[PDB]
């Protein structure tokens, strides 16, 4: 102490060789340095709650690595043992008991509005992700990926592909198999538009299968609406064409542009509108609230008049859902893993089973003891497990 709590590098520079020569001297200094590593990172990272707070967190994690790598590679000749200390300390300054969600917010702001500057800044991001312990990053990201892909708000395609290209290297095709499908569609969608334009503006986007986490007709529209099935007559077959009226929009010449209140304006701008809802009246009530919001003179039950007092151009529940939406897949994978492991070995210890399943499924999810406790309930519900009654620690094959 007092030589690692501060540093005059001459002192421990002399110190290292002597303890490397004599046996059993080194281990103490490893933990001694590890203890001092945390102090920075437990400092200057707390008391940080403000606007644009995800940026500051990543703008403070990196400097701890940066300063401490130079010393362990200069004063003391590089040693994998000293590398191990820094890593373990860094694997416990950003995973204590939000930050995994904050990382997605970090990526969201940068891409949304120089390219070399963007690449240089994104280069540092890949370092922090390797220390995070990831399901939220795998699922939560596609949600604002979709909002950037559609409704405009799409950046240089090069940056979008570069993010994927860099992230794919770290975890291979398995982690990010899906998202390669989304970006390919938009290039195909533009090409798909070109061919069917000749069958005659109405522009149309297609969406691949149901892998995307994305989820009365106007009387003037049917002529083009049912003409789209001629595209099936051309090159598609058996696919259920899905006019998803909820999320879509469109710039139309009413004589805003989201189909909820365009569906309202289909009778407004032109009881009868209540029949035209083709849906529950609560959703239409939401759409009339949209009118009541700003600058729209209803006679109001649904009695409506006009306003002569006329831009020229027309949520915690999300993460509340995402908290358990991933968890369901966690329970399913826990059941799977339980079946495979106790049916394979058949003679293993059940606490050793807990450890083995922890080792096998560590990459898939962070293990939790209670979920493992509740595994046997459904298996014994059907008596699927041939639960070894002589010793629950030992197993017998289910058949």
């Amino acid at each position: 102490h007092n030589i690692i709590r501060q540093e005059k590098k001459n002192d421990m520079a002399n110190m290292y060789v002597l303890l490397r020569a004599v046996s059993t001297g080194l281990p103490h200094m490893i933990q001694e340095l590890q203890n001092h590593i945390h102090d920075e990172g437990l400092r200057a990272t707390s008391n940080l709650t403000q606007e644009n707070m995800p940026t500051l967190f990543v703008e403070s994690v990196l400097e701890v690595h940066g300063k401490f790598v130079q010393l362990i590679n200069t004063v003391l000749n590089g040693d994998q043992h000293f590398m191990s200390a820094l890593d373990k300390a860094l694997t416990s300054v950003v995973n204590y008991r939000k930050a995994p969600e904050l990382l997605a917010k970090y990526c969201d702001n940068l891409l949304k509005k120089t390219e070399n500057e963007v690449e240089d800044r994104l280069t540092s991001f890949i370092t922090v992700f390797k220390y995070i312990d990831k399901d939220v990053f795998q699922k939560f990201y596609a949600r604002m990926l979709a909002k950037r892909l559609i409704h405009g708000l799409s950046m240089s395609m090069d940056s979008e592909e570069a993010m994927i290209n860099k992230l794919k290297q770290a975890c291979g095709y398995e982690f990010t198999s899906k998202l390669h499908r989304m970006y390919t569609d938009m290039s195909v969608s533009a090409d798909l538009n070109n061919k069917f334009n000749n069958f005659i503006s109405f522009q149309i986007y297609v969406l691949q299968a149901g892998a995307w986490p994305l989820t009365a007709i106007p009387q003037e529209l049917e002529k083009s609406v049912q003409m789209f099935e001629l595209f099936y007559s051309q090159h598609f077959s058996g696919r259920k064409l899905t006019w998803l009226h909820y999320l879509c929009t469109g710039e139309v010449k009413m004589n805003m542009v989201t189909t909820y209140q365009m569906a309202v304006l289909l009778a407004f701008n032109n009881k009868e509108l209540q029949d035209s809802t083709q849906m529950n009246e609560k959703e239409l009530t939401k759409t009339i609230k949209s009118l009541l919001d700003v600058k729209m003179n209803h006679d109001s039950e649904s009695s409506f008049s006009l306003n002569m007092n006329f831009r020229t151009k027309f949520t915690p529940q999300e993460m509340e859902q995402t908290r358990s939406a991933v968890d369901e897949d966690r329970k399913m994978y826990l059941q799977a893993a339980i079946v495979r492991i106790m049916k394979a070995r058949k003679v293993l210890r059940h606490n050793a089973l807990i450890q083995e399943v922890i080792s096998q499924s560590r990459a898939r999810f962070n293990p939790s003891i209670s979920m493992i406790k509740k595994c046997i309930e459904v298996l014994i519900d059907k008596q699927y497990i041939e639960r070894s009654q002589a010793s629950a620690d030992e197993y017998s094959y289910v058949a």
Binding site: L207, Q208, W212, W243, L244, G250, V252
Partner: peptide
């Protein structure tokens, strides 16, 4: 004008 349309191919 321009209706913004999206539709997913499902159960090909």
């Amino acid at each position: 004008k321009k209706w913004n349309a999206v539709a997913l191919w499902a159960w090909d």
